[PDB]
Amino acid sequence: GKQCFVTGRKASTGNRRSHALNSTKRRWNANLQKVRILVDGKPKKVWVSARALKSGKVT
Amino acid sequence: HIKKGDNVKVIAGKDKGKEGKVIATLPKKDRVVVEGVNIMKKHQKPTQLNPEGGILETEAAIHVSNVQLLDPKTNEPTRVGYKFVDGKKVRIAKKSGEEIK
Amino acid sequence: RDILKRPVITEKSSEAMAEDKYTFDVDTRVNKTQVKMAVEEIFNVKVASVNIMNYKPKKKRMGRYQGYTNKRRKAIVTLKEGSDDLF
Amino acid sequence: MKAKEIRDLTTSEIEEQIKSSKEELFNLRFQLATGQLEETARIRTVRKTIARLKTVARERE
RNA sequence: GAGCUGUAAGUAAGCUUUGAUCCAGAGAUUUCCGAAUGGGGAAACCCAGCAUGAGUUAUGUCAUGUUAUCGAUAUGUGAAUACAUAGCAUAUCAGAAGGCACACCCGGAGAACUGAAACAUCUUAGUACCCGGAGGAAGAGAAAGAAAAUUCGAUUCCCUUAGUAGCGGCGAGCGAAACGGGAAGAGCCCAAACCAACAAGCUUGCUUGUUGGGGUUGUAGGACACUCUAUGAGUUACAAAGGACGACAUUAGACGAAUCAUCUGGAAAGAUGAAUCAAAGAAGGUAAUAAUCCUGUAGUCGAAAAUGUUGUCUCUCUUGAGUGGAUCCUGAGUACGACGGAGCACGUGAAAUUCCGUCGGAAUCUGGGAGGACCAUCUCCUAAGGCUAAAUACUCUCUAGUGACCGAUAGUGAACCAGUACCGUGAGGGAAAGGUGAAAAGCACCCCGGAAGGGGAGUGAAAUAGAACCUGAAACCGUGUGC
RNA sequence: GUGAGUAGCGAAAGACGGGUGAGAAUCCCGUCCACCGAUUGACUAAGGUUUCCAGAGGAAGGCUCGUCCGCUCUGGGUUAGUCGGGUCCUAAGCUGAGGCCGACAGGCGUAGGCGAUGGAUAACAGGUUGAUAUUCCUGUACCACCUAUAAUCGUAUC
Ligand SMILES: [Mg+2]
């Protein structure tokens, strides 16, 4: 599906409690930002999460 | 054990105490055919080309553990053992020792 | 090459046209063109027309179990020179 | 028998392969249709002497 | 080692003592459909391209040979845009796909009726279904550990601890671990500090970019400083990877001891009599119930060959410690904290240790973590890289063998040619069937009949066992007769 | 088994003479009679898969009977350069190299393909068998391709 192209972080699951503890399920999602990362060939349009962008943000 | 051409001696049957010769051995059912021993009276199909209204009399097969191969040097049907220093098993009567054929 | 298994000599539609026509039972998978180059490289004659037809398997029943027979392709040659391609 | 009276010559394999396949078993299955129960045990033997002639040509590869 | 041609009965024509049939290993052939793979398709069929080859005076028609898609090494070659890069044209390539044992295992996702005598947190349950990955096993694994002794020294599985400590609308219910006894028991490779080269710096750097040497731990161990040894030590199951010579096991096979005569019988293995062998009296068959008739068993014995398991013989490869103390190193968006969830027996509870999403975010040996909030001294241990056999869970199968397990409405749905007749558009549902006799010797011939079916004569111990074929119960339909 | 030798026998015009046979209201042949006739008649699609046809059968099936048969045994039957399809074309739809999305499975879609119920597409009379006919053979045709060819035209042509 969708992953961080640098690290590899992705979604999760887990329940969703309430004030009376009824529990549906839900899904967590990595904060993925499209950015132009220089790799071999062309610097493509990739999917990178926003925690791997604090130092390694190439143009 | 028992093959065609050699004498026998029926030990257990309605026609016991009779010698003879082997005619043809069924190998799978372990049945041998001896002349003059357990003869039939077959109601033949008289519409066949050969005969004119009759009854055939051909011998019926007996099991191989009813005959017993004899060498009457001591007037006795014996059992068989095997000796070979010749590249081929020569059949031996254990109760007398002689080489039979 | 041998793509002519047997002839067939049945009552009228095989042996009551014997002035120029003959009837073989060819193997399947073959044309009517190959039979022109198969009854010529055996008997040394010169055909004029080859016709074919196909029969389905038909049902026989013996004992307590049914089965089908074998399907068969049938050819009918017609000569121009020479005669008596069966004896 | 037939099994090693063959290994006679390389060229005379196929010139006898075409001699028995084409010109013997084809005559012995036309004559079965027009009427012959004279030798219906030649059809097994001239077919099992084709298998011996198409086994030796694998040894010469 | 003499009969054979699957069911095989039945005839035909044959083959075999110049060793056939039958059995085991190894090679040969293995049409078309199938992941289907030249393109197409409603599986088992239809249409082609370029090379060599037959054929025809020549087209038409045939045979062999190849040609799917991604990936990644390559060679070209113009790229919108000069250089040049996504495209494109080819040579190669045991690379990949699908099938599964519906068993066991590890991950991703993941319910309900039900129990609580209703029901929602909870239990049923991280179970059933489904999807991905493999293996002969998989997973965990070489202490930032248990614990409170003058501590011992990876993990895994059984016994006990124990239905105890706990968690719980404190309801229903869920439920450990270390100690102690055992089965089994081996530990090792990188990163960094660094020394030497080769493409970019006078570059200031042996650090950076690549590749070889170095170097692995807590009693603090390595760079660097010093001497004292440099042949013994090997593994290719962890730690680097390439052959022979015969030992033993498996898939054919051979030898293998000893009973004769009478009575009843259709038949002796039976009872009555005498004999014998026994590392052999397990079992099956033979006209009835056999240690001695047959096939065999205890015991010896056997491999042209193709795998398989190990011994030692090669052959590859390799440095082993101690003391010093100045300097450099010892895994970073990492550990951890707040908000939201999951999981540990433990339901946010005072909640430790463990992982996930989001933002914040470190110290560097006088360091860092844990010991059930937290802080202070004593105590053990060294997180953020990786690879590891055995004890353990299974059985669709192949070989020997057992059973106070079944004996045709039983045991498999199935002892009969069974997932088959038959029902359904489809997924899917699914029964019924066994027995002549010791041997087919399975009723020649006469007679009533169109034939069936009978009655005599015959085979057989018995047809009152005739293929409606062993024994033949009751219900129910008959014909006869004493009251 | 009782219900019981009861309810049924599935619209509808038959009568007789002759044969056949162990057996006939039922089978075959003859004459008279009645019924449909915008159909109970004559050809082709869909679907079924040997039923079609000749010679022999009478245990089962046929709502009775049966010498009969769409039922049993043996032996036969379907012929194409021109008819309906394929080697030609595209609708709705389906599938899809790269590509774009999604816990996995997978969903969508561009170039290209597949897909007739439509467009294109060269043959008609007569004879014949116990069962086949624009198919087989009689007489005359036509479209595509190939080979010899002569009058040949030539920057002509494809
Ligand atoms: Mg699971």
Q: How many CB atoms lie within 10 A of CB C23?
A: 19
Q: From the centroid of its chain, how far is CA A26?
A: 16
Give the three-class secondary structure for C80: strand
In sequence order, what are the residues at sequence separation of 6 or more whose Cβ sits closer than 8 angstroms to the Cβ of residue A28? A11, A12, A13, A14
Residue the block writes with tokens 């409690």: A17
- A5, burial (CB in 10 Å: exposed 0-12, middle 13-18, buried 19+): middle
Token reading at C16 = 């009551």
Evaluate whether D52 touches D2 at the Cβ level (below 8 Å): yes
Identity of residue B61: A
| Whole-angstrom distance, CA of residue B80 vs CA of residue B38 | 25
C-D C-beta contacts closer than 8 Å = 18
Residue of D nearest to C6 (CA): D30
| Whole-angstrom distance, CA of residue C71 vs CA of residue A58 | 74
Closest residue by Cα to residue A4 from A59, A55, A46: A46
Evaluate whether B20 touches B6 at the Cβ level (below 8 Å): no
DSSP letter at B96 equals T
Closest residue by Cα to residue B19 from B91, B86, B68, B74: B68
Using CB atoms, which residue from D26, D32, D33 is nearest to C2? D26
Q: How far is D40 from chain C (nearest CA, A)?
A: 16
Evaluate whether C2 touches D30 at the Cβ level (below 8 Å): no
Question: b/e map of D22-37 (b: 16 or more CB within 10 Å)?
Answer: eebbeeeebeeeeeee
Identity of residue C76: I
Q: How far is C7 from chain D (nearest CA, A)?
A: 7
**Solved with:** cryo-EM
Token reading at B8 = 């026998």
For residue C54, what are the domain limits?
1-87
Residue the block writes with tokens 């021993």: B37
| Whole-angstrom distance, CA of residue B31 vs CA of residue B13 | 14
Instruction: Say how many domains are in chain C.
Output: 1
DSSP letter at D58 equals H
Residue the block writes with tokens 């992705």: A10
| Whole-angstrom distance, CA of residue C15 vs CA of residue C27 | 21
Instruction: Give first-to-last CA distance, chain A, whole Å.
Output: 24
Q: How far is D50 from chain C (nearest CA, A)?
A: 15
- Sequence-ordered strand ranges (E) for B1-101: 31-32, 42-43, 55-56, 62-63, 80-83, 90-93
Evaluate whether B54 touches B41 at the Cβ level (below 8 Å): no
Query: Which strand E bases fall within 7 angstroms of a protein CB?
Result: 1-4, 12-14, 16, 18-19, 27-29, 55, 60-62, 85-86, 108-111, 120-122, 254-261, 266-269, 285-287, 290, 293-295, 333-334, 340-342, 348, 356-361, 417, 439, 441-445, 458-460
CA of A31 to the centre of ligand 1 (A): 29
For B36: left if phi > 0, alpha if psi spans -120 to 50, otherwise beta; the answer is left
Token reading at D25 = 């078993």
CA of A9 to the centre of ligand 1 (A): 23
| Whole-angstrom distance, CA of residue D7 vs CA of residue C87 | 37
Token reading at C39 = 């009854």
